[PDB]
């Protein structure tokens, strides 16, 4: 129940604001900046500010704070969802999120803000649907918004019906400094880039553990996703009844389903780090990386970030495989590897000096994070079975999909 | 299918070697399509196995069935899930319609000795589906 959603800037200047209820004076935005400065300087800064009886909820964008003031006990979650939808719409319409576009497309920006929500109640959220009525370069509103299918525009015609899927894997590993992995969760991501003619209704079928058990085929390798969240086009009733994944695919790239379950397998990369840090004399980086993934798989663009000392200087690198570059901006050593075949073992020996003068304050021990990304690898073993592409006119579809395994929250606690 | 014929002798020898009673990961060949076996494909595979032999009358075992499913998946891209047997006790009917192979007793259901038997009526009669309507959806 936000009173007015506004777009601010890094210097406190409001790029654009649009009142929806009018219950709060527009001059309250001036006090938002001092309140944020005080909260940050005292550690009490939070996304939802509070200026007396009015709460100033704001989120940090690429360059501006999307502040949405409110007065009553409105749905904070609803405000957050509206802000996320607005951010997605801005990203779709504007390729850049900075002050260069905020002051460059205000003519269409005002119309989009007016059309998106009214009186604090969001009404339009389809970026593709909104692009059919609001353009920066007007006809009646499309019937798709009025119709039940607001995620599949009818009448779309394509020369070919090719859909590019994406089996994106997220390997999140939380290895403590004691050597044990605490948080080992893998989040699936079934994203498809559908480009076909008409309004096809995808009939998804994969190797799910629940589906195999229900059909009686619970004996092969089936993925038991702890959390499975369908997209907007996905029908909740069909999945609730018999795990029937039937929905109308959108026009373009969209996230249909996203698996989320814990992992009980060994890490794909085993990283052993050593710290022979002399007392203000030198430091040793006994970093050893063991690839626990299958030898048939290669981790392309592997970047094992090793945090070096804050005041460290004059580093010397004695490694075996992979380029090592010390970036002073990040204050860490990135064990950069172009391609890392599975089962590889790379040994590195860092050595640098330290200033004689001791530091006045501690710097902390940031965790070691790697940026491995091995495509065409399915650690979870979930295999897609079929995708029921049905059209009223009738056409032969040629769906495509690629499985990509990358490194997510794969942080390693430092000693 | 020359590749299937070539792999049939080695697969049969491996199945015979395994008694009736190391690497991690899930590598996938690039660009190879993966889908469940079809009824016509299952019928053709059953006919080929019957003609070449080594499948009818062989003692049913988990390891041999897994090896056969893996060989079929490698040679054709068919998921090793259509080669399922109906729940016991007694004769186990194929899970996928069109399959010409079934497991029958040769003498707890796990302790019963099963043998693969050819069945042409399986490709035309859904005995397993009739027995377990819930499993077929």
């Amino acid at each position: 129940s936000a009173s007015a959603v506004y777009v601010l800037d890094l210097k406190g200047k409001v790029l654009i604001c649009r009142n929806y209820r009018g219950d709060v004076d527009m001059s309250e935005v001036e006090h938002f900046m001092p309140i944020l400065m005080e909260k940050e300087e005292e550690g009490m800064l939070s996304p939802i500010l509070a200026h007396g009886g009015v709460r100033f909820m704001w989120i940090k964008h690429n360059n501006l704070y999307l502040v949405a003031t409110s007065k009553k006990n409105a749905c904070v979650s609803l405000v957050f969802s509206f802000l996320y939808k607005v951010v997605q719409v801005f990203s779709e319409y504007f390729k850049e999120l900075e002050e260069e576009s905020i002051r460059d497309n205000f003519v269409i920006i005002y119309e989009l803000l007016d059309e998106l929500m009214d009186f604090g109640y969001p009404q339009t959220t389809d970026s593709k649907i909104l692009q059919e009525y609001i353009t920066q370069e007007a006809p009646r509103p499309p019937a798709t918004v009025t119709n039940a299918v607001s995620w599949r525009s009818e009448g779309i015609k394509y020369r070919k019906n090719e859909v590019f899927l994406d089996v994106i894997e997220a390997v999140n590993l939380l290895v403590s400094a004691n050597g044990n992995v605490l948080r080992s969760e893998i989040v699936g991501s079934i994203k498809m880039r559908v480009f076909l003619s008409g309004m096809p209704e995808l009939r998804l079928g994969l190797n799910d553990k629940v589906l195999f058990d229900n059909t009686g085929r619970g004996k092969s390798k089936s993925v038991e996703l702890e959390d499975v969240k369908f997209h907007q086009c996905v029908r909740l009733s069909r999945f609730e009844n018999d795990r029937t994944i039937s929905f109308i695919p959108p026009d373009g790239e969209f996230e249909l389903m996203s698996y989320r379950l814990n992992t009980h397998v060994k890490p794909l990369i085993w990283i052993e780090s050593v710290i022979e840090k002399h007392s203000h004399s030198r430091i040793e980086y006994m970093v050893k990386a063991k690839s626990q993934f299958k030898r048939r798989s290669t981790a392309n663009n592997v970047e094992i970030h090793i945090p070096v000392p804050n005041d460290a200087d004059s580093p010397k690198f004695k490694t075996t495989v992979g380029s090592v570059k010390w970036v002073p901006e990040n204050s860490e050593i990135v064990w950069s590897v172009k391609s890392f075949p599975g089962g590889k073992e790379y040994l590195m020996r860092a050595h640098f000096g330290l200033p004689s003068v001791e530091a006045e304050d501690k710097e902390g021990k940031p965790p070691i994070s790697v940026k491995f990304e091995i495509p065409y690898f399915t650690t979870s073993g979930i295999q897609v079975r079929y995708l029921k592409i049905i059209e009223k006119s009738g056409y032969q579809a040629l769906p495509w999909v690629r499985y990509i395994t990358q490194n997510g929250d794969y942080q390693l606690r430092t000693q | 299918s020359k590749s299937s014929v070539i792999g049939w002798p080695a697969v049969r020898e491996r199945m015979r070697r395994a008694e009736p009673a190391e690497e991690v990961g899930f590598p996938v060949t690039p660009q190879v399509p993966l889908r469940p076996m079809t009824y016509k494909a299952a019928v053709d595979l059953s006919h080929f196995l019957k003609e070449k032999g080594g499948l009818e009358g062989l003692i049913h075992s988990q390891r041999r069935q897994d090896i056969l499913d893996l060989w079929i998946y490698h040679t054709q891209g068919y998921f090793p899930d259509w080669q399922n047997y109906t729940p016991g006790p007694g004769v186990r009917y194929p899970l996928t319609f069109g399959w010409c192979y079934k497991l029958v007793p040769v003498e707890d259901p796990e302790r019963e000795v099963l043998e693969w038997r050819f069945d042409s009526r399986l490709a035309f009669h859904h005995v397993a589906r009739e027995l377990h309507p819930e499993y077929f959806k």
């Binding site: 079928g205 029921k388 999909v401 | 660009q31 399509p33 076996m37 996928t96």
Partner: peptide, 18 residues
């Protein structure tokens, strides 16, 4: 080609489940 795993053809449904 393309980094992240080459695109592969997909089926229409579980042919083995009828």
């Amino acid at each position: 080609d393309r980094k992240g795993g080459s695109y592969s053809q997909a089926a229409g449904s579980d042919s083995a489940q009828s």
